Amino acid sequence: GIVEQCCTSICSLYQLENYCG
Amino acid sequence: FVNQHLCGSHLVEALYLVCGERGFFYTPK
Structure with a gap:
């Protein structure tokens, strides 16, 4: 989930935007 | 600012x- 993708590894815009409404 | 490790409030801010x-x-699970 987001923590594994963005906190414990390096985040990306692609991934963040999957969590936008 | 997004292409780094972001945790907790820093992630929420992003x-x-x-x-x-x-x-x-x-x-966060």
């Missing part, structure tokens, strides 16, 4: 700035 009026969901 979602807030990127998502804007779309809103977002933060589900």
